[PDB]
Amino acid sequence: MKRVQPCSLDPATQKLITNIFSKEMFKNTMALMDLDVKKMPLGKLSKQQIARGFEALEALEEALKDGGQSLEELSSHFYTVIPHNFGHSQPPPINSPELLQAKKDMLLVLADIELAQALQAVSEQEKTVEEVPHPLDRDYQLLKCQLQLLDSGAPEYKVIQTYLEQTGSNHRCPTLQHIWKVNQEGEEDRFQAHSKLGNRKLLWHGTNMAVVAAILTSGLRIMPHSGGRVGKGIYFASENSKSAGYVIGMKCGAHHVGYMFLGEVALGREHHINTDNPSLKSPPPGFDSVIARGHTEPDPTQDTELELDGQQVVVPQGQPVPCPEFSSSTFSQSEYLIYQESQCRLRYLLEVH
Numbered sequence: 001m002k003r004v005q006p007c008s009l010d011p012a013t014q015k016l017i018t019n020i021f022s023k024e025m026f027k028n029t030m031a032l033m034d035l036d037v038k039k040m041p042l043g044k045l046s047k048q049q050i051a052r053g054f055e056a057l058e059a060l061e062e063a064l065k066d067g068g069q070s071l072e073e074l075s076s077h078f079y080t081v082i083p084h085n086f087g088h089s090q091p092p093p094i095n096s097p098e099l100l101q102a103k104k105d106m107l108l109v110l111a112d113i114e115l116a117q118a119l120q121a122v123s124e125q126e127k128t129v130e131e132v133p134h135p136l137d138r139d140y141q142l143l144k145c146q147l148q149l150l151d152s153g154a155p156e157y158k159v160i161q162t163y164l165e166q167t168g169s170n171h172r173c174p175t176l177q178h179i180w181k182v183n184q185e186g187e188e189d190r191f192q193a194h195s196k197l198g199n200r201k202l203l204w205h206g207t208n209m210a211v212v213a214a215i216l217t218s219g220l221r222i223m224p225h226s227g228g229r230v231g232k233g234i235y236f237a238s239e240n241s242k243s244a245g246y247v248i249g250m251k252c253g254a255h256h257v258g259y260m261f262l263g264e265v266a267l268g269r270e271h272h273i274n275t276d277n278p279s280l281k282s283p284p285p286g287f288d289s290v291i292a293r294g295h296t297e298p299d300p301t302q303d304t305e306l307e308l309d310g311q312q313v314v315v316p317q318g319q320p321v322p323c324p325e326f327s328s329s330t331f332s333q334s335e336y337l338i339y340q341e342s343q344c345r346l347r348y349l350l351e352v353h
C-alpha cells in the first residue's frame with residue numbers, strides 16, 4: 001500500500017487544479033456542446049475519433065463549395081462519428097458556413113478535453129514508486145507549468161485589477177478572486193525569438209474551463225481548422241468584456257466560476273482592418289499582426305507599462321473611448337490577431353466570479 005504525500009498547494013491553487021481537471025466540468029462542457037456523453041464517455045474519447053470527426057467535417061466543407069453525397073448524408077456520417085444528443089430527435093444537417101465552423105469549434109474544444117484525459121494517464125514509474133504525490137500535486141505537475149498565486153501588493157496586481165475593472169462590462173463586471181503568474185517554460189525560447197520586435201501589449205484571452213488545462217500545458221495554439229472573423233490565428237482583446245464573452249462560467253455553490261488569461265503579445269508592425277476577413281492566414285507582407293479595429297478602444301492616454309523579463313509591455317488602464325477613424329468598422333470592439341504561436345507568451349491566469 002502506497003503512501004499519499006501531503007498536498008503542497010495553497011487553497012486557491014488546489015481549487016483551480018480541481019476545477020480544470022474535473023470530470024463533471026468536462027461532461028458539463030460536452031453536454032453544453034450537445035454531445036452524447038453516455039455514448040462518448042471521457043475515458044472513451046480518442047485522438048482517432050476526433051481525427052475522424054474532422055475528416056467528416058472536411059467532407060462537408062467540400063460539398064458546401066457534382067453527384068457527391070448530400071449534406072444530410074455527410075452530416076449523418078459526422079454524427080455517427082461524434083454522437084450528439086438532441087433529446088433523441090434526429091440531429092440537424094450541417095448546411096451553412098456558420099454551422100460548419102461551430103462543429104469545428106466544438107471538435108477543437110473536444111480535442112483539448114481529450115488532451116487533458118491523455119495527460120492524466122498513469123505512467124509506469126507512477127505504478128512502481130511506493131509513495132505518490134497528493135492527486136492535486138500530481139495534476140499540477142502534469143501541466144509542466146509554474147503557477148504562482150499573487151497577493152494584493154505584488155507589483156502588477158493593481159495594474160491587472162485596473163485593466164479588468166476599466167475594460168470589463170460597466171454593469172456586471174466580473175469580480176476578481178485570484179491572479180496567478182504563469183511561467184510555462186519552453187514558451188520561453190520561442191518567445192525570445194521576437195526579442196527585437198517592439199510593440200508588446202498585455203491582452204485578454206477568455207476561454208471555457210474545459211480548455212484551461214490544455215492551454216496551461218501547451219500554450220495558445222493555432223490548430224488546423226481554427227477560424228473566425230479574422231482567420232486562422234490566435235485571438236485576443238484589449239477589452240476584457242469582449243474576452244469575457246467566451247467564458248462559459250461553471251456553477252459552483254451559489255456563484256459562477258471562470259478563468260481568463262493575460263498574454264504578452266509581440267504585435268510588432270500592426271495591420272489594421274475594419275471589415276471581417278475569415279480567410280486570413282498571416283498578416284500582409286511586412287506586418288507582424290492584424291488588428292480588427294473596434295468602434296472603441298481602452299483610452300490610450302491611460303496606457304501604462306509593465307516590465308516582464310526585461311521588456312516593456314503595454315497594459316491598458318483606461319475605459320473604452322470612441323475611435324472616430326473606425327466608427328464604421330464591422331467590429332464593435334478590437335480583435336488582436338497573431339498568426340505564429342511564438343508571438344504570445346502566457347503571463348497571468350485570473351479566476352473571476
Ligand SMILES: O=C(CCc1nc2ccccc2c(=O)[nH]1)N[C@H](CO)Cc1ccccc1
Binds near residue numbers: 237243336
Ligand atoms: O475558446 C476559444 C477562444 C475564444 C476567444 N475568441 C476571441 C475572439 C476575439 C477576441 C477575443 C477572444 C477571446 O478572448 N477568446 N477558442 C476555442 C478553442 O480553444 C474554440 C471556440 C471558439 C469559439 C467559441 C467557443 C470555442
